[PDB]
Symmetry: C7
Subunit: 46 residues, 7 copies
């Protein structure tokens, strides 16, 4: 309820403050996650 | 009763936010991506330390 | 009998919601995302 | 590989339901079950937190 | 290594005489079905 | 080095002379096949464990 | 906040490579798919060995 709407409202405030389009934020975070996942996989394999 | 009741409950919560559904999805996806990056960094330091401890005391 | 019966069962349940299938999928995706965020916060701060 | 694909094709064709509907319906069922698993894991993490406090 | 792996998968897929997008869709349906079974067993246990 | 990693992947993909979207699709099919095998193995293990837990417990 | 800082950090690294963002994403996806196939093969041999050990002991 207020836990869900308050959480969404908080994320919206933070994203708006960056002045970066939301689709760019998502793409850039996806690239960082992919890079870290590749590092973790290499470590696990060795 | 359980599946349809669950969907009806989520719909009530989402409608009360007065935020477009695709925005709610995008914002939660961004928060999840950020937290997953933090967890991956913790797991990487933890694997490196665990491997070193196994070497030093094994 | 196993696969077709499973599909037929899910179809009956979804139809009984009286909500378009793509809305059911979207709403369940939002609930899953919210719960996954809570779990990640607990794992990181504990 | 080819035998596996041919088998899945036979089963899906026998349902007389469009392939994209089969995929969507199975995805909805999986999402519902994953929400239940997440709720169980969250009560489990809360219990683990309480046990750390008590002992 | 990488190119040899890709060339091998291409040979196997071509031998099925099934469009690549259908192979992907059918394997996705099989995986979804098995994942549902695994989730049901984990939830009761 | 992030840029070095990207440049390395680009060199390997270019050398295959296969469109990037085909490389991605073919690797996705191979991954899906192996994941199905792993799920079948896990399900036989869980099924056996369930039966045993019921019979003796 | 911390995400504004994280976003600019990733942008700084990606811009330095002078490769379009969608290419960076695609190339990293291909590398991840390749490594995931290798990990799945290792997990499958481990599950097979674990099954044999349960039989022997």
């Amino acid at each position: 309820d207020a836990d869900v709407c308050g959480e969404v409202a908080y994320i919206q405030s933070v994203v708006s403050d960056c002045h970066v389009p939301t689709e760019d934020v998502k793409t850039l975070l996806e690239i960082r996650k992919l890079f870290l996942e590749i590092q973790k996989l290499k470590v696990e394999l060795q």
